[PDB]
Amino acid sequence: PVVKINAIEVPAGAGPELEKRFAHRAHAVENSPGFLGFQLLRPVKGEERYFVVTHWESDEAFQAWANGPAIAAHAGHRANPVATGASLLEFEVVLDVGGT
Amino acid sequence: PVVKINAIEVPAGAGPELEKRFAHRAHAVENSPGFLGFQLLRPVKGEERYFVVTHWESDEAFQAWANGPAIAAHAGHRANPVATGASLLEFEVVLDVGGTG
Ligand code: HEM
Ligand code: HEM
Ligand SMILES: [C-]#N
Ligand SMILES: [C-]#N
């Protein structure tokens, strides 16, 4: 599996609004082939960006989503997005261990 | 829940050895109170650091682990650690949503 993190930059104090929008649009990625889920992570220390941690069965499944479905998923709402920037951080899962 | 990511810097070519050592000690933190699990993430694009993504029921549970058990968990092995640096990135989980798979 792979992990693709969108690290989002938002103005100071814009956090609550960003979170609000994600919550409202939490289910935009439903039904996507190869999608394993995502977390929205609020920064507390060591980072100032929100991490949108998305999980996929393969890089192929992610690239398929990015090439259309993601664009549709981000369309159709309130103008003026909150983010001032974003960086895509891409990983392969080496280990995945549960807490026993 | 909270997420604590240890972002590890390793020399070129040091990847496999780091991964090896994590695999060997993967189950040292397994029964820690409040520990929900972890992933070791190998960078492919946009980052050069390994991300060690650890999940905890609370900041309190993580802090208890760090103040002793974590030190114990990292002790007693190869006299030459691989990493050249590390930064702890700390988050609160706002949303956690499942998928198709
Ligand atoms: C994993 C790869 C992803 C990429 C590369 C990506 C891309 C982006 C980018 C560039 C932005 C800033 C510009 C904009 O707001 O349109 C953004 C914001 C946003 N994205 Fe994503 N996204 C990803 C995942 C997700 C997922 C999984 C969701 C929701 C389930 C999501 C929902 C949102 C929302 C709600 C915003 C803020 C929109 C606003 O401020 O009005 N994104 N995304
Ligand atoms: C937020 C959680 C964690 C923090 C702050 C942390 C701290 C550190 C630091 C500072 C290093 C670099 C110095 C060293 O090699 O000892 C390191 C490396 C390492 N950590 Fe962690 N750690 C965390 C989670 C974990 C977990 C969950 C595991 C295993 C299940 C783990 C296993 C290892 C291993 C195998 C190394 C490399 C040791 C070597 O190269 O010889 N760490 N950790
Ligand atoms: C979505 N970021
Ligand atoms: C462990 N980092």
From Swiss-Prot, chain A:
Source taxon at top rank: Bacteria
GO molecular function: metal ion binding; monooxygenase activity
Pfam families in the cross-refs: ABM
Domain annotation ABM: ranges: 2-91
EC number(s) on file: 1.14.99.57
Binding site for heme: R21, F22, A23, H24, R25, H74, V82, A83, T84, G85
Free-text function comment from the UniProt entry: Catalyzes the oxidative degradation of the heme macrocyclic porphyrin ring in the presence of a suitable electron donor such as ascorbate or NADPH--cytochrome P450 reductase, with subsequent release of free iron.
Assigned protein family: Belongs to the antibiotic biosynthesis monooxygenase family.
Entry protein name: Heme oxygenase (mycobilin-producing)
Organism: Mycobacterium tuberculosis (strain CDC 1551 / Oshkosh)
Biological classification of the source: Bacteria, Bacillati, Actinomycetota, Actinomycetes, Mycobacteriales
Gene: mhuD
